[PDB]
Amino acid sequence: SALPTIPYHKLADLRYLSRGASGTVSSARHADWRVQVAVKHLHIHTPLLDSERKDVLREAEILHKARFSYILPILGICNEPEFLGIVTEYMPNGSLNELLHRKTEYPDVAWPLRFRILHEIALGVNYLHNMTPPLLHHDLKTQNILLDNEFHVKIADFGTIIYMPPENYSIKHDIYSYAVITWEVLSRKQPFEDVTNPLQIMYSVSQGHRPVINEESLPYDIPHRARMISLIESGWAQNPDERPSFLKCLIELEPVLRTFEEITFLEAVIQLKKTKLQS
Amino acid sequence: ALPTIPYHKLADLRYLSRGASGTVSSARHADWRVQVAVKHLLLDSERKDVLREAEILHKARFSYILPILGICNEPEFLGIVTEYMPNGSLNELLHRKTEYPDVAWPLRFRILHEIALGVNYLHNMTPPLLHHDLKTQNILLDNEFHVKIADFGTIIYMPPENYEPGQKSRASIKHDIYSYAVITWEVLSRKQPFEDVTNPLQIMYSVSQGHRPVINEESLPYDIPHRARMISLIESGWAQNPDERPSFLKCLIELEPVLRTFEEITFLEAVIQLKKTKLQS
Ligand SMILES: Cc1ccc(C(=O)Nc2ccc(CN3CCN(C)CC3)c(C(F)(F)F)c2)cc1C#Cc1cnc2cccnn12
Ligand SMILES: Cc1ccc(C(=O)Nc2ccc(CN3CCN(C)CC3)c(C(F)(F)F)c2)cc1C#Cc1cnc2cccnn12
């Protein structure tokens, strides 16, 4: 009702970004708003395009109902014979995944920025869980966490199974994913790197194994290392009932975040952008 | 479509403004764990004025418009909840020279660019929204000094053809751009428009007759980047003839090349400098 319908011909300079499941994510410039945008457009040459339409409108309805500071903001729908899609704000600094694992482009990612990111992911998911009815994400991974021009988090949805809790091979799924993500953020390692076949991963996890917690994985200089290890281990407990709520997580995190002097967040970000611009 | 937030979910309320439509207070939402602003004012008609405002803000979601988070609608309490903007208004940034003694040029242009992006979006809605009360007091600044447009001495932002009220003045499509020109002059000078004249009727008369804030070396110093493109923009914007004034879409197009000369890192640096001086001074 409030959601603009954007004609395809109003979208200029389309550049590919991703080929997600049903179709492509591209960057563009809106000709009248003069801002950059992202657009997710499904393929037109499918026999199952009838249901494709339905999926797109259901997705836009969701994103629109879920407006919030840490959820990717939707700007409109494209709905024409030649072109079907969702338009959102464009996040110039890509995904958390890239931030963590492109060590040539991002050789230092200061601790405060990392805790901010974890705090904001929690704020986002928590808001979804507090909607009426609750929205459950059920596909959290670092690929789905986007970062705006100041490296604030925008949660989205588009190596799969590592973020999945064993009992899904549920109100307690997102928090499992968030624990792995947390391990991932503090370590900058791929969970289960030295492990080829993902069936072996599902088995190991079935049996209670988790990413390794180590001097090698989580070095001893991590601020609040021990509070954070507790959070991770609660979060990915074999028993879903031992895993905490996101609200409990935020409460555990708030004092950790209060330790950082506010200027240090901006300093962490300015450093990153400076190094990124030189790669 | 828009959450209804119970008053008892809002913790630690602290006064901020006693604006037009009610009191504006800061608070913390007990379940979302974020800070918020809340504007709280017949059970027939008072509601409609608030519900009409929330409908507007909700219809107008965009990067540079103040984001509405919900409505409070209870027997004890009626209001609108929005995101909270910790760095106050553009007005404070410009005129509190003790707290903010240097405001680097690039940050200033970014702000101007973003005000234009906001008003432009309003003008492009269906039907168009017209602001008609732009001033520096209504431009808010988020944690990284990005702009959020809002609405809550005054006549200086008003174009002369709106002095005589009516159905002409209301449907004027060229009001916001006049206000934006004065704001622009204000941002580049950090002077009050018409500081020298005591009585605001003499201001209305002078403006009736084509006079505008003074442009020169004292008001707009020679070191302003793109001084001459910017003076042109201001002057087209506040032209006596409404038809010579540009659309905000034209405005943005005139600005885009100016903004492109600043390396993007420079905006963040300007913001760091502010926060450092605000803290160390
Ligand atoms: C164009 C576009 C369209 C849609 C979506 C999208 O995220 N849709 C979405 C669907 C569902 C949900 C919640 N559910 C999860 C599943 N489900 C079981 C529950 C409900 C959410 C969430 F935000 F709420 F999480 C989002 C993102 C983009 C993007 C983009 C973009 C912007 N900058 C860049 C830079 C690089 C790459 N991409 N990119
Ligand atoms: C709680 C709250 C509620 C509402 C509004 C509000 O701005 N409502 C609004 C009404 C109409 C319009 C557009 N129209 C203009 C007239 N009109 C003829 C056309 C339509 C717009 C606009 F933004 F779109 F302009 C906004 C702001 C606040 C705030 C706040 C806040 C947050 N942090 C701080 C820090 C210090 C002080 N305040 N504060």
Residue numbers in the entry:
A (entry chain A): 8 to 165, 188 to 198, 207 to 316
B (entry chain B): 9 to 49, 55 to 165, 188 to 316
The authors write:
NOD activation induces pro-inflammatory signaling by receptor-interacting protein kinase 2 (RIPK2, also known as RIP2 or RICK), which plays an obligatory and specific role in activation of NOD-dependent, but not Toll-like receptor responses (Park et al., 2007). Once engaged, RIPK2 is activated by autophosphorylation (Dorsch et al., 2006) and further targeted by XIAP (X-linked inhibitor of apoptosis) and other E3 ligases for non-degradative polyubiquitination (Bertrand et al., 2011; Damgaard et al., 2012; Tao et al., 2009; Tigno-Aranjuez et al., 2013; Yang et al., 2007, 2013). The structure of RIPK2 exhibits the canonical bilobal kinase fold followed by a 16-residue αJ helix that packs alongside the loop connecting the αD and αE helices.
Type II binding is confirmed by the first crystal structure of RIPK2 solved in complex with ponatinib, which reveals an allosteric site suitable for the rational design of RIPK2-selective small molecules. The structure was solved by molecular replacement and refined at 2.75 Å resolution. As a result, RIPK2 displays an inactive conformation of the catalytic domain characterized by a “DFG-Asp out, αC-Glu in” configuration. The RIPK2 structure reveals a homodimeric packing arrangement similar to that of RIPK3 (Xie et al., 2013b) and consistent with the dimeric state observed in solution by analytical gel filtration. The trifluoromethyl group occupies the hydrophobic pocket vacated by the inverted DFG motif, while the protonated methylpiperazine forms an ionic-dipole interaction with the main-chain oxygen atoms of Leu143 and His144, positioned within the αD-β6 loop. In particular, the allosteric hydrophobic pocket occupied by the trifluoromethyl group is greatly enlarged in RIPK2 due to the presence of Ala73 in the αC helix.
